[PDB]
RNA sequence: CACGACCUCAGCUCAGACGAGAAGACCCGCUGAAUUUAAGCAUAUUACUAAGCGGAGGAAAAGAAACCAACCGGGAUUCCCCCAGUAGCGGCGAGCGAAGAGGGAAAAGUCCAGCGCCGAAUCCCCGCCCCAGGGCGAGGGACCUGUGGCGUACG
RNA sequence: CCAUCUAAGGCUAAAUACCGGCACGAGACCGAUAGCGGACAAGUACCGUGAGGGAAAGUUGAAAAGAACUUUGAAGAGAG
RNA sequence: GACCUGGGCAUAGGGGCGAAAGACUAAUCGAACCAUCUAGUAGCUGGUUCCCUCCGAAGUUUCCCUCAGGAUAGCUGGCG
RNA sequence: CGGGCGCAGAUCUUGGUGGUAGUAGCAAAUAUUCAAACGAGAGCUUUGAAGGCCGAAGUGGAGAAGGGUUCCAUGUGAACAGCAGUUGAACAUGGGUGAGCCGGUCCUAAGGGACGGGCCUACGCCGUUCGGAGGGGAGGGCCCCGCUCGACCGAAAGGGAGUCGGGUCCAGAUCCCCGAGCCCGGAGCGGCGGAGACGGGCGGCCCAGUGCGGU
RNA sequence: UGAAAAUCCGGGGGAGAAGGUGUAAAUCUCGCGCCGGGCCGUACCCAUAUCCGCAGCAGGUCUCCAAGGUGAACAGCCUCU
RNA sequence: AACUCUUAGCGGUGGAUCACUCGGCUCGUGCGUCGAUGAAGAACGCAGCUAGCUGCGAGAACUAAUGUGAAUUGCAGGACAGAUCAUCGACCUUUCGAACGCACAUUGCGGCCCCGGGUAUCCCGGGGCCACGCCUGUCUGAGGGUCGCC
């Protein structure tokens, strides 16, 4: 959780509230990165290309 | 000597001799050689034991104590081990030499 | 069971990703040599052990 | 009884996947693999089964490093040097 | 993205180009899940092999300095020593093989095999 | 009664090396059966095999005579041919079974301990100087409870 | 009496072996129930808790030119 | 109640375990299973693959831990 | 010239196909019916109504072991689901399991198993808190104090600090959202407050004070 | 005669620490504030069709919750969710 | 009529036969090379579309170098078209495994050093380590074991 929280702070420069890791049945770990209240996940999703 | 060479894999059993007896124990002192010490690898008169062919010579009947049990030697007493081992002689005397023209 | 080890769950993850049928373009590649995935397993008829 | 009604009471693993040979022969209570002898330092390889020896001998896997020695041997184990540049 | 063009650059320039290729591959991973484009998905392998190419130049440039730094030293790191074969590394060196005792040095000096020929 | 020498025995993630496992056709050292044959069967045979255990190398092992021989004598070892299904072994039953010579392939011989001479003339480690090959350190050790040179049955 | 050797320490190439391995050549051999279990995603699928057991399965055509289009049918499947 | 029962443990093949039935020990128990020795041996059942031509039997003798078999003589064929 | 050279048999081997045979059979646990919808197609799907059953030692609601995607949405109706199917635990395409306070993790139970030693020709075996110079930590600043000391593994039902309420999804939930907490660890200042700390005897001096109440 | 151990706590002990007249040392004050809590499991079935018995097999497979009426009843019979 | 049987044509069922063969088998020849510098084996992962096989290892369907000289191809797309292929001396080479801090039905539980960050304390991340046996040497020691000096 600390490596994922520090990775998104370096790749996208966003403060993180909490991270919830989860290993999917296909073997991939899925992270639920919750941004700080002063950061909007929609505005970051547009910058990274999700939307 | 096979028990000292097994506990010391990094050394090679050179020889062994008798130092004591008892009703229950026989005591022997085994001479082992560190085949990677420079005082031994740089002496040409003992570089033979540093070769890979002498790995665990005490476990193959090559040391003087173990070679005595093999029954080898020149003469009529040792007709069983002509050709090296007794199994080399047994394999030679039990191999059907089917020639090309026979 | 819900209680799994990481090695078992990682083992089941590989078998879950191999239980996929062959791509359609594979039959055009090898000249219809591989017609179907002969290693398809069903969760009832064949177990993993 | 001894037959059908007894197979229903089978829900306890005796063997699991071994860490050395990857086979499902690692006896749990004995803590010993039934196929490779793990955790013994030496692998069990008996001469009364040529087929069992055939399935797990050298050459049945990848040989990630031994196949490179075969390629390095045919060139004299050349090291340190590089081909002449253009 | 040419190996010959990377061997002239410095260490900080290779790391910057390595970083630029990593932010580019990350954006290609986003396009792979958002639908992307056929012209954009095929660029994934180009960026990957260019990352492998930049990362290769960095490694063999580092070891080239390491093999130069430890040259002449008595003890070299294990990865800088010749990995011929476990059996070959444990053989007598060419120095120790050429060592002759003073007895066979004299035996080879005056009792070596002569060059001769016999008529019949 | 501490301080020294030595002996014996410890500790270390000390400095630097080594061993382990795999494979195992061929090879070396052990261990070891019973089907089978004897028209039963117990010794025998199977077999100093299968399986089991240990250890190697590109080969291994063997090997330079406490040999063969009994001759006008041969001359390390290994292998081939022959000796020879012979000498012999064996409920002398079933069965088993070599060797010397002879002919060939290949051939290569040697090192110590001891004995007693040489001011330990010897070795390792460390730090170096020149060009894998040679030197140096009023550096640290090993070693006289014996290193090296000479020398080994042919004197 | 004669002959022969000098045991209880060490080394040693070459002739010799090689159903494993690496790389080749060949065949009065086998020709898909044969030949290796395996000419094919074969020690695979599959079976047994396990040690282990262990298959079946080669061939359109020179070239997919792999049957556009029309038509009946919900579709397979048909007629052209 | 000498009760029923899960999980974790222990005991392994001439061994275990048995309030004893030779019971149980993975549908296998008066000695589990797996692989190998092993293509184990069988005087005993079964089968033993094209044609035509010619000749053509024996179930009797003696011996045999033989009497469902052999040896032996006789009978048979072929070669001359 | 050389054979793996001729089959009807071997309860032969392998493969294929018959008669039986549209046959046995699709008969355990009371039950279905009407209408409508979608649809090429309906006894079997869906919806409603009706009449029934399981009757809380459920044919109900949740887990453990085991299964391993069987969960969920959509599509398909070839094959399979022993009739059918518009249905499915089938097939195809996607999606889904979020924790300091649930469990593992920590502890040792039976037990397993190293270590010392012994044994074993050996691979190894024996043995398990005993048995070795088995301590690697100090306080105090170069000095004296530490074994009742036997590794470790072994419980998702034993021991073991602390999370509950409401809401939310096609499938997640004590984990996500909101709200209200809690536990443990951490702080040369560990950030403040309070406690320690209430005053006595002499004329500034001097003496106290590591809390206090109730028999 | 019906477990061990981790862990936690109380007391005994008074070795020590603290300042010299207002404080100091010290504080087990949920008095308060500050920071952190990693890794793994987590869907679903759990049985007259998701487990085992070759299967959607009348078999086997450890638990939790459990209403109204009749009745002594967790009996049978009926009903609600 | 049907049904049954026989015969032939045709159509099925079925797979023989024949022809084919990048396979097997056997013989011969040359080499005869694993591993703590982490082997064999195993696990997991890696492709634009990829399940298996095969090839690789987070540089993951291959990097560099050399040779070669226009392709790969199922579909694209794109080649910094020196494409591709071969060679393979550089570099890289996850986890388990002799497997090595202790273990493991646990991605569990520790220790040391260093670096970076929040801020020496702690927390987070990274790097280098910590198995057993044994050899030479160093260092630190032990025992009235044998002495010397007192
Ligand atoms: Mg099932
Ligand atoms: Mg072995
Ligand atoms: Mg000399
Ligand atoms: Mg070995
Ligand atoms: Mg007999
Ligand atoms: Mg007989
Ligand atoms: Mg008998
Ligand atoms: Mg054997
Ligand atoms: Mg070798
Ligand atoms: Mg040779
Ligand atoms: Mg030799
Ligand atoms: Mg014999
Ligand atoms: Mg002779
Ligand atoms: Mg001599
Ligand atoms: Mg020798
Ligand atoms: Mg075949
Ligand atoms: Mg083959
Ligand atoms: Mg139980
Ligand atoms: Mg038995
Ligand atoms: Mg009886
Ligand atoms: Mg036969
Ligand atoms: Mg008869
Ligand atoms: Mg035949
Ligand atoms: Mg026939
Ligand atoms: Mg899915
Ligand atoms: Mg049906
Ligand atoms: Mg539908
Ligand atoms: Mg469903
Ligand atoms: Mg499916
Ligand atoms: Mg534990
Ligand atoms: Mg509990
Ligand atoms: Mg209790
Ligand atoms: Mg749910
Ligand atoms: Mg105060
Ligand atoms: Mg107190
Ligand atoms: Mg659930
Ligand atoms: Mg049932
Ligand atoms: Mg089964
Ligand atoms: Mg009632
Ligand atoms: Mg109840
Ligand atoms: Mg009632
Ligand atoms: Mg007729
Ligand atoms: Mg026909
Ligand atoms: Mg590795
Ligand atoms: Zn194993």
Give the CB-side neighbour count of residue A27, counting CA atoms within 13 A. Answer: 11
Chains near E with 3+ CB pairs less than 8 A apart are A, B, D
Rounded to whole angstroms, the Cα distance separating E43 from E5 reads 20
**Which of C12, C13, C14, C16 best tests the A interface by mutation, with the highest count of A CBs <10 A?**
C13
Chains near D with 3+ CB pairs less than 8 A apart are C, E
Rounded distance in angstroms from the CA atom of residue C10 to the C1' atom of nucleotide I192:
52
Helix H or strand E segment including B40: helix B38-41
- What was the experiment behind these coordinates? cryo-EM
Count chain C–chain D contacts defined by CB atoms under 8 A: 4
Backbone angles phi, psi at D77, to 5 degrees: 55, 50
DSSP-derived secondary structure letter, E101? -
DSSP per-residue letters across B59-96: GTT-SHHHHGGGT--SSSTTGGGTTSSHHHHHHHHTS-
Chain H bases near protein CB atoms (7 A cut-off): 6-10, 24-28, 35-36
Answer yes or no: are the C-beta atoms of B32 and B40 closer than 8 Å. Answer: no
Among E residues 9-68, those touching chain B with beta carbons less than 8 Å apart: none
With CA atoms as reference, report the closest residue to B41 among E97, C26, D70, A23. E97
């Amino acid at each position: 959780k600390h490596q994922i929280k520090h990775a998104v702070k370096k790749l996208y420069d966003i403060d993180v509230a909490k991270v919830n890791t989860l290993i999917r049945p296909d073997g991939e770990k899925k992270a639920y990165v919750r941004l700080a209240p002063d950061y909007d996940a929609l505005d970051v999703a547009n910058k990274i290309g999700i939307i | 000597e096979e028990r000292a060479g097994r506990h010391c894999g990094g050394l090679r059993v050179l020889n062994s001799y008798w130092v004591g007896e008892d009703s229950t124990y026989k005591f022997f002192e085994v001479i082992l050689i560190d085949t990677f010490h420079k005082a031994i690898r740089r002496n040409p008169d003992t570089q033979w034991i540093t070769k890979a062919v002498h790995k665990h010579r005490e476990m193959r009947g090559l040391t003087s104590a173990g070679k005595k049990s093999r029954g080898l030697g020149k003469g009529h007493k040792f007709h069983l081990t002509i050709g090296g081992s007794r199994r080399a002689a047994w394999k030679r005397r039990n191999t059907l030499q089917l020639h090309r023209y026979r | 069971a819900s209680h799994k080890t990481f090695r078992i769950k990682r083992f089941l993850a590989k078998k879950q990703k191999q239980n996929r049928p062959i791509p359609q373009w594979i039959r055009m590649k090898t000249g219809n040599k591989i017609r179907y995935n002969s290693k398809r397993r069903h969760w009832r008829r064949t177990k993993l052990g | 009884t001894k037959g059908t009604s007894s197979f229903g009471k089978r829900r306890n693993k005796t063997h699991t996947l071994c860490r050395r040979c990857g086979s499902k022969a690692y006896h749990l209570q004995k803590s010993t693999c039934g196929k490779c002898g793990y955790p013994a330092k030496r692998k069990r390889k008996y001469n009364w089964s040529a087929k069992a020896k055939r399935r797990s001998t050298t050459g049945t896997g990848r040989m990630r490093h031994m196949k490179v020695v075969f390629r390095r041997f045919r060139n004299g184990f050349r090291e340190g040097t590089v081909p002449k540049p253009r | 993205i040419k190996a010959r063009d990377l061997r002239g650059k410095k260490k900080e320039e290779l790391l910057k180009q390595l970083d630029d290729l990593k932010v580019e591959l990350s954006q290609l991973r986003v396009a792979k899940v958002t639908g992307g484009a056929a012209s954009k998905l095929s660029k994934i392998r180009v960026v990957r092999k260019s990352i492998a190419r930049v990362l290769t130049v960095i490694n063999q440039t580092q070891k080239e300095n390491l093999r130069k730094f430890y040259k002449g030293k008595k003890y070299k790191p294990l990865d800088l020593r010749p990995k011929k074969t476990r059996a070959i590394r444990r053989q007598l060196t060419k120095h120790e093989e050429n060592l002759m005792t003073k007895k066979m040095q004299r035996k080879s000096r005056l009792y070596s095999i002569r060059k001769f020929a016999v008529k019949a």
